[PDB]
Enzyme design. Structure first.
Site, short mmCIF file in Angstrom:
data_model
loop_
_atom_site.label_atom_id
_atom_site.label_comp_id
_atom_site.label_asym_id
_atom_site.label_seq_id
_atom_site.Cartn_x
_atom_site.Cartn_y
_atom_site.Cartn_z
N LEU A 1 -0.49 -6.31 4.62
CA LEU A 1 -0.71 -5.10 3.87
C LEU A 1 0.32 -4.12 4.41
CD1 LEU A 1 -2.37 -3.52 1.77
CD2 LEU A 1 -3.98 -2.94 3.61
N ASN B 1 0.85 -1.19 0.00
CA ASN B 1 0.00 0.00 0.00
C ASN B 1 0.89 1.24 0.00
OD1 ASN B 1 -1.90 2.05 0.33
ND2 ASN B 1 -2.47 1.47 2.42
N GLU C 1 -5.93 -4.37 11.29
CA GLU C 1 -5.17 -3.16 11.56
C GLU C 1 -5.20 -2.87 13.05
OE1 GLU C 1 -7.04 -0.31 8.56
OE2 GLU C 1 -4.97 -0.26 7.85
N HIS D 1 -9.71 0.98 4.84
CA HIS D 1 -8.44 1.32 5.47
C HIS D 1 -8.70 2.38 6.54
CE1 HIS D 1 -4.36 2.76 6.17
NE2 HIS D 1 -3.93 1.66 5.58
N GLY E 1 2.79 -0.80 4.56
CA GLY E 1 2.78 0.63 4.28
C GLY E 1 4.13 1.21 3.88
N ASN E 2 4.74 1.95 4.79
CA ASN E 2 6.00 2.67 4.53
C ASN E 2 7.13 1.80 3.96
OD1 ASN E 2 4.95 5.19 5.24
ND2 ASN E 2 5.61 5.01 7.39
N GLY F 1 0.93 4.61 15.59
CA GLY F 1 1.08 6.02 15.98
C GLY F 1 0.69 6.29 17.43
N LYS G 1 0.02 4.18 -0.29
CA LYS G 1 -0.70 5.31 0.29
C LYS G 1 -0.59 6.51 -0.66
CE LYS G 1 1.65 4.81 4.22
NZ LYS G 1 2.07 5.04 5.64
#
Lengths: 246, 246
Positions: free
Chosen positions: B228, B8, B163, B93, B230-231, B169, B10
């Site tokens: 899935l 992803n 998730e 998401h 991300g970064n 965060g 993003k």
């Protein structure tokens, strides 16, 4: 004022239908220095549409993000549009405000993101049936325009669109005379906030029902500088709407 | 179950950066008949990304409309995605639930539309730190899954994503064992709402923080079928995360 005719294809199109539609559009011989003609395909159709339309046509996207690059799944940043040389963005379409809770603050922040990244913006606003019936047209329009209008740094690069929500899907019809008076008032708001020269320079488009029949009655009004055309722009006859601005 | 490693991106990328990354991605020789690897670029980057990535890589988009074709400016319908042979969609998401007010009802409607149009769906859900601290993990996830789970007819074509918002965060970190325990409960929820065969068939991915250091420990868990990512999926080392599922 240079006329401005836009095709908002909304959520419509196939690879095949765009191929033949762009072909018929390409057949129209017009001078892009004499009028702006902009096509807004669906995001995933942009590259396809851009390549098939001749360079005389401008292109853009139907929405842009208020956030920059980063953790915003599903969003398209103004930075990304700039890198792709996507010239125009639509901001504040009534359908975004209606279905996706897009606020006046969202509109403000999307315009800022766009201008910061040298995107040209087509900004939409308009009052509902209830608002008009309660005689709040000017109150609503003033609030909506003042939400973003002070940010305009170039009055060729931002284009305003009046959407008569009161005359979309309601049974009511807006006359060119009615539309003209709203356009006149919008230009006055731009004058009072940005200046006279700036008000005289800015394009204000009609975003209600436009077709091959009514297009001339609308564009010939003094303060109506073109249109953001919906369903009629999915047809080959859209060239006749462009011709009204030629 | 066929392992499933997803990228992803993003809201990230330029034409240049995608060119460089896809080249690195293409260097990895994996068998698509035994492993699913899917890349989700930004909408306007889709064509570019698809043409550059070898076909062993499946591709998709990061969001899809809950509406069909028509007057939905800014949206991409499941119909348009099908026409473009876009294989996968991400739905629900947390960034869309957080920033764009996407509800369980939206997630249901997006999934119904995707399946009607023969798209494969990557559906996200999970609980906040507050919810986990109130011991409500199972209550929250059960509600989120049951919002859409009855729509699944083919259990190869819908892929679930846990998730752990509580560990995103927040300063908290999920252990692979902690992830596993939730995945196991999710599979039980599918078993009791859809059937045992279906539950053993459905892939459940971890959608928390995945990198080269933790991917092996996570994929090894019996109920974690992939990620899935991300970064870390914006890096050339993403190939090592794919390798962990090979």
């Amino acid at each position: 004022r240079k006329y401005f005719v836009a095709a908002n294809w909304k959520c419509n199109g196939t690879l095949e239908s765009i191929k033949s539609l762009t072909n018929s559009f390409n057949n129209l011989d017009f001078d892009p220095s004499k009028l702006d003609v902009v096509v807004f395909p669906v995001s995933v159709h942009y590259d396809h549409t851009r390549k098939l339309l001749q360079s005389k046509f401008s292109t853009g996207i139907q929405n842009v993000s208020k956030f920059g690059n980063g953790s915003y799944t599903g969003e398209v940043s103004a930075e990304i549009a700039k890198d792709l040389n996507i010239e125009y963005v639509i901001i504040g379409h009534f359908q975004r405000r209606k279905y996706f809770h897009e606020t006046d603050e969202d509109v403000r922040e999307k315009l800022q993101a766009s201008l910061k990244n040298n995107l040209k913006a087509v900004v939409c606003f308009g009052e509902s049936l209830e608002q008009r019936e309660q005689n709040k047209t000017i109150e609503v329009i003033t609030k909506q325009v003042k939400a973003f209008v002070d940010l305009i740094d170039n009055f060729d690069n931002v284009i305003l669109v009046y959407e008569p929500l009161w005359a979309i899907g309601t049974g009511k019809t807006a006359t060119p005379e009615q539309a003209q008076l709203v356009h006149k008032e919008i230009r006055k708001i731009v004058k009072d906030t940005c200046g006279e020269k700036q008000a005289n320079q800015i394009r204000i488009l009609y975003g209600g029902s436009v077709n091959t029949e009514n297009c001339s009655s609308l564009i010939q009004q003094e303060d109506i500088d073109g249109f953001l055309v919906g369903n009629a722009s999915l047809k080959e006859s859209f060239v006749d709407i462009i011709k009204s601005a030629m």
